[PDB]
Amino acid sequence: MWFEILPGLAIMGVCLVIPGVSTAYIHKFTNGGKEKRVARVQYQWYLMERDRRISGVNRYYVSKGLEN
Amino acid sequence: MNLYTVIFINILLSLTLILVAFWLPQMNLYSEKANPYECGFDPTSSARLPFSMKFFLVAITFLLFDLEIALLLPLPWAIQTIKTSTMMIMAFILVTILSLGLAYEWTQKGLEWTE
Amino acid sequence: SRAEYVVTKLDDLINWARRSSLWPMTFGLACCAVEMMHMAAPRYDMDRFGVVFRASPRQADVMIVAGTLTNKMAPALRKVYDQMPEPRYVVSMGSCANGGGYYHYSYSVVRGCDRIVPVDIYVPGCPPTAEALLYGILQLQRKIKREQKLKIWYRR
Amino acid sequence: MNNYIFVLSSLFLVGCLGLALKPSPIYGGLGLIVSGFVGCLMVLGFGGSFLGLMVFLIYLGGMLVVFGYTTAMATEEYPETWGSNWLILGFLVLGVIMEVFLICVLNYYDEVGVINLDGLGDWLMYEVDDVGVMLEGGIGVAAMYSCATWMMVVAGWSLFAGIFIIIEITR
Amino acid sequence: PFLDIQKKLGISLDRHFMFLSAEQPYKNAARCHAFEKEWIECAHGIGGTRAKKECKIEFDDFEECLLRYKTMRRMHDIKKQREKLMKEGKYTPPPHHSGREEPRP
Amino acid sequence: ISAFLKNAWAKEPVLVVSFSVWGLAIIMPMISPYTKYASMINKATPYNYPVPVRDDGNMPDVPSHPQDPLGPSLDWLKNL
Amino acid sequence: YPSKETAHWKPPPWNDVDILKEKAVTNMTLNFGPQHPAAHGVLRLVLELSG
Amino acid sequence: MFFINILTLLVPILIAMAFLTLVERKILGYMQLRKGPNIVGPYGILQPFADAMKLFMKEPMRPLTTSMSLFIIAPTLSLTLALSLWVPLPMPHPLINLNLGILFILATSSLSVYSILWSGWASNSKYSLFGALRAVAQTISYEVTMAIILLSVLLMNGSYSLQTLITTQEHMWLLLPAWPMAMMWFISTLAETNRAPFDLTEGESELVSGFNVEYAAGPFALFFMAEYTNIILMNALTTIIFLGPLYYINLPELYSTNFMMEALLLSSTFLWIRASYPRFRYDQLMHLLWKNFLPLTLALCMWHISLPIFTAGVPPYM
Amino acid sequence: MPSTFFNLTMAFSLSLLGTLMFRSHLMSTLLCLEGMVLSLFIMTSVTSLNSNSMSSMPIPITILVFAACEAAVGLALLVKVSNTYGTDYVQNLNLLQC
């Protein structure tokens, strides 16, 4: 019947959901728990560079709070 | 660096597939297999003879319309202007001119094809 | 176990691919083409067996000679066979094609397509039933299933 | 990454030389598309995004139409490629080697005046508004709709009258 | 312009983006805004021939700001001398010039 | 000539809708009451630093603090 | 003032039109069969096409 | 790690296309009252791999009359662009955040035409030339209206970046404000992918095969792979632009799943249409577009320039 | 910047050389005209971006607009030329010598 279309469509769906989930998780993991910052504009790039220079480890995601 | 990396990986993947395709299968090459194809009977002429185009006018009109799309594309940034009256008036003028040109070419049987 | 074992399994995979996906070229010369169409029809459904028609001989595997092979036609059939890429197989369906058929003693008809091309499977009939042609296709799949090309190379 | 823009410019020169040697129009259009891509990359490296993407788009369309016309009208039985004629092939290789020699000669004669293979890439981008917001070329090109309105007026009339002109010419 | 129709009518179809100091979108000043303004104001009033001699200082400064040749040569000389010293083993760069510095926010 | 328009609506609907929406686009900006607010919002969007002005003592209107009652107010946008 | 080089020149036509050799318009020839999906199997419909 | 991300974005997409072939064949079968593939593995799940193997193991061919350079280049370019276009897509976080993502997509897709064109010329065969020139006509049709459609929706999006579309449709679908634009976009994508009804560049009936008449084995496989990657890509683009999924910053996987559902449904709709409808005559395709879509598209472009101004709803830049 | 501008100048010069030195095909000459246009566009855009003179970036797009218009006129002339002399070879374009 029509139920036999669903198998290949299931393989489809898994292979099409894998990309987004994978990229999101990789971004979080490689940017330390926060989704990748976006530099649409030179101001945001400047802020990210300031964060990198302030981290002391040369990584923009490492954050410093009032304790600093 | 990342866009370069991804596009280079794509290029390498495609090239690797091409190389596999061209160097894996067993090859038996002879003239009949390598000659062009035309539905069973040998060609009667070359494929490089002139091939008249019946839509040349709309080809050039496509060039012009592509450039007018070019003029239109800055609109998303333009709309942030403080001179909205002028922006809107100029965009309306441009689109109206496009429409009138299309209307003229339509009424002069331009979008039709030569026979 | 042995390089022979791995080569045998590789050959098995090779033939599994080739037999599971074989694309007949859209060739049809007379009545027997109608029974080929019916074989394509829903009731038997060639596609179910992985068989799908393709027009360009450049993208085909099996040439199903369906119908009489007239002298005038013979050169065209020979060239399309030659232009098919290897590996390629020829299936002859109908008396018209296996031999001269009803028109065997005529001045125009080539008495059998096997004279113009090397045939693999001969399907008899007039017209062979769509079921008969399906059985012939399965026979060709069996023929491919026993190939031993890689094994013959390794032993070579 | 210091020689990036110089390499792109050199590849652009190579593409333009190939175009100049006027091979068959099909291969000329191929080389022209490659040159357009190189120019887009150069503009993007200099930081303009809209302009480079823009040439790429416009000229994909333009060279499509050029393909159509050349295959409808500018075709021979035996189209000539770059390697078809030893004259063209030899002058292509000669162009490459002579341009390299000229680059070296200028480098040695004056190391700063024009070409500076020493410090190549140091003097690409000069100033940047680090804390600015709008800096992208899109805003500048959108100036047409607000300040440089005369510019868009003339361009639009150019296209509008172009339609009539081509209609009558092809009549 | 050969016909001063724009000046007569008091309109500026194309006179308002002639140079770098002109108004730019969203008040993003260009490179050498100050130098070009100085040159333009110096040359205003006095004719072209007088300007070519009198406003020479301003024009030269603007050329320097715009094309930057003397700065390029200055840097080339510095780096060539540093390379010579390094080959002779006379000089070593400081940590910050070598990439190891204490970053400033 | 209502028959002409009505036959057009019957046989060549696309052109009729195109011309109608073109007319509506030209008309509505004049009719609409909210047209004024577009330019005001664009001006409101503060994209450059508000350079302070030296207090010479002759500047009553300009404020001395962002939270002072003087100067532009954006409540008209806050409840546009 | 004639010259050996130009002796083969002729006066231009009174109207600008020049009696030019007729261009023999050649139309492509296409087999369109027999082995074609739309040729019913055994038709060599040699077509003469422009565009 | 970026390489792991590249793998996780390419391998699943290639598998998705591979199985799209099977899904097309089975859906067409069950809609034509037949079962389609169902022998090669349980429910025919191994048929795509069987066919890929057969194609890559069949002899590759270099006809004597071909321009071998472009003959080998164009397929590679087709697959390269097909894979590349997946890069900027936000699902929801993009692999590569380009500010002018939509312009990137437009330019790359427009370059895809040159694969067909150069392949058709290099084949040096009459049917191949026919296919190349029909591709010329198809592009001349679709591009002019595609660009204006995207501009019209962008006037409400606010920017050319795709990632902005998610926030724009955080409350509703773009379809409701602009279904008229959406249907023309859908037909235009149909035309662009060379899919039926506008399957003219490879009209198996008229021409035995268009550009890919002299191409066999792995090169032909590359062309087919690029085709069925582009189908999924365009359906994904529709799902992102219109038919906006749901974004909850805490739950990205919800966006991922909603996107997969909508893209799968639209890709199936493509095959539905293929089975349902006949084919156009490329002159009729061109007339359709230029004389119906283009006028209305231009009028809607002016309408959507007006709407932000007179509704006081100009979107935020950035 | 300076080396890139020099290279672009050489590219334009080579395109102009190709334009001034014909080679049988008129469409090829039109393509060389295009190559010159593209080199000029790139030079203008680079200059504007490097100067940060945003008020000048409309000018390059107008360059493209008018270059496209000229190319369209050229292609129409090619249409007429082929419809007359059967091909696009410039040798046949010599009726006005007398």
Ligand code: SF4
């Ligand atoms: S074999 Fe019999 S049924 Fe088949 S084509 Fe010949 S006469 Fe007809």
